[PDB]
Structures are given as C-alpha cells and as structure tokens.
Amino acid sequence: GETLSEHVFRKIQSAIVSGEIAPGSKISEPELARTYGISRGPLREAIHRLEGLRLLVRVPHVGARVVSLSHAELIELYEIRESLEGMACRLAAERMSQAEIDELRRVLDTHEQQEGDYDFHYRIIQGSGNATLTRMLCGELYQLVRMYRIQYSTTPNRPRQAFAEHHRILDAIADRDGELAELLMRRHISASRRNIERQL
C-alpha cells in the first residue's frame, strides 16, 4: 500500500506534466490543499519532492512555482540524458539476451506516437541490466522530458528522421557493438534536443 503523501504527489505530478497546470504557474498551497482536503503536514513532503525533480521551483518569499521550462533547463535535462541513454546502449549491447533483441525488433516494426518512442527506449534501458539507471531515466528524467514535448510537439519531418535513427541503434545493439550504439544514441538524443530548441 501507498501513503497519502505519495498519492498527492503523483496526482500533482500528472497535472504538471500533462499541462493542466501551466508552466510558471504559482502554486496556491492552502488553496490546492482544499482541492484534496489534506493537511499541510504531508503536503510539504510532496512539494519538496517535486522541487528535487525540478518540476517545481522554490521562490523565497512567495512559495512554489511551476518550473520555467526555459532553455537552460532544457540543456540541463539533455546533458544527463545524453550520458545516461548513451551508456544504457553500451550496456544493452553487452547484456541484452538474444530473445530480448528480437522483442526490441518487433516493437519497432509494429509502430512503423510519443509512446512508441517510449517503448523503444524503455526496453534498451531495461536491457542495460542496471536498475538505478531505470530509476533516473524512466522515473525522474522522463517526467521533465514529457512536459517539454507536450508544450512543444515534434516537427512534421521528425518522426521519419527519428525512426531511421532507431533502426540504426537497434542494429548496433544486435551486432553487439556497444561503442557504436552509444555514439548513435548520443546523436539521436542530440537530434531530439535540437527539435525542441527550434520551437522555443
């Protein structure tokens, strides 16, 4: 079972990621507490966790604000993403069983929108054999990625460019070439960042 402080966290985290609460919105704490009817005891525990995930920001006199969704935060998020997703492909090419790679191939063929992208990257991170890697990618970093993409959709020709990048990454993992797969993942993540930048 979950605690009350955890139920409030994820329901707030979903409203921020999906866009129900706009970026930069001031969080009315006694007001939002009336929406769920729970004391401020465990409520600060929820807000403090969202500040650590850099979904909210602590303003010193005023209180908590939804993150700026700015250019500097985008560079911060894709720096770590490039390093973590890169080493995930390096370990996946080393550790993914054969049957794991064909399953990764099926998911690619069928999807031939942003959740099909999640499916491809999720297996690779899972195939890396590192649970701490999954917590930082799928648990923390992918939450801020999801709310940049909702506010800034992909450009018309991106899904075709990104799909070919996926095929080359999978082919390097199947060939057990971790050095090439890490390099291809970095280019693919860097291409995703430049897409969001062109719409800021």
Place this chain on the structure above:
Amino acid sequence: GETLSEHVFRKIQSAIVSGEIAPGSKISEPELARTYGISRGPLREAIHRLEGLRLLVRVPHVGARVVSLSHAELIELYEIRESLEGMACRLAAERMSQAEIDELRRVLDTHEQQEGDYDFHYRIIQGSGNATLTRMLCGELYQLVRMYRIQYSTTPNRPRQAFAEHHRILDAIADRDGELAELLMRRHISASRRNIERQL
C-alpha cells in the same frame, strides 16, 4: 521547515550509511516506530524512499531489509558513477571560471581522509553548472558509495595513487581539455571500484 516524514528519513539513512545498522539487517518496522514514536502513516513514505535509493530492499512476505552490499550492486553503482562523474569533468573544463579552478587547486594542496576526496569531487560537480547532476551524484549515488567505503576502507597505498590521479584531473580541467578530463575521471573512478573489489 521540514516535515516529520523527512526527519525520520535522514536519521534512518545516516544509521544505514554509517554502519549503525548492519548490511542485510531486517528492519523491524513496528519496533523501529517505537524508537521514534511516530505512526506508520508517514513511516512507509520514508522506507519507500530508501528502497528507491537502493539503501533498503523490499522482501515480499517479510518486509524491508538493509541492502546486500554485494558485488552486483557495486557494479551497478560505479557504472552510473563513471558516466556521471565523467561528463561532470567535461562540463567543468568547459564552464568552471578561472577563480573556480584555483579554489579547486587550494583544496588539493592543503589536503596534501575520505572527506578530502569528497571536497575535490564536489567542486567539480558544482563547477559542471548542472544542478540535476549534483542531485544524482551528491544526493543519491554518494550515499551508497559512503557505506561501501565504511565497510571496506582503502588499501594502504590507495591515497597516494588517488592523490596523483586528482592532480592530473585538475590539470586537464585547468587546460580546458574536457575530453582528457572525462577520460582521466573514468580511470580514477574505475581505480576506486577495483580497490573495493579486492576486499570483497
């Protein structure tokens, strides 16, 4: 101000890291709740966070256990550490102001034990200009590092070997060579892992 669930978390996290609670120890939940006298409402919120940090482990019928401190967990922890500390040096050589580098040089000269190591790595991660990087290194990963080193001290000749490795890393950062500094950091982190492995 902090919440009660957060006060209990850090006091438990300190007892696990320092070694007051042995690795693999079964956590008696109603018993440990009597030690602090707080209901199980916010208590599960503390245990769940420690499982995410992989300091505890959830056993399905029994409950929570202190982490195994095994060889597989050591490889998991130093995989991410190599990638994150490596890119931290790459960004630090790009972004650390001049005055930041001399300050990093002073700390090295004076310390010429495991907290002097923390001081050197802390400035570099701080100099990387990435706050999310600091949260994952100093906040989460360094907690599991601290409890491996307490249970397994350094070998007699390690501080001399590690000190020279620090001087070469700082020299690459001062020369603004991010590619070399990232490579030197990886070798230095890999050397630290092999030290702990020799005592397992």
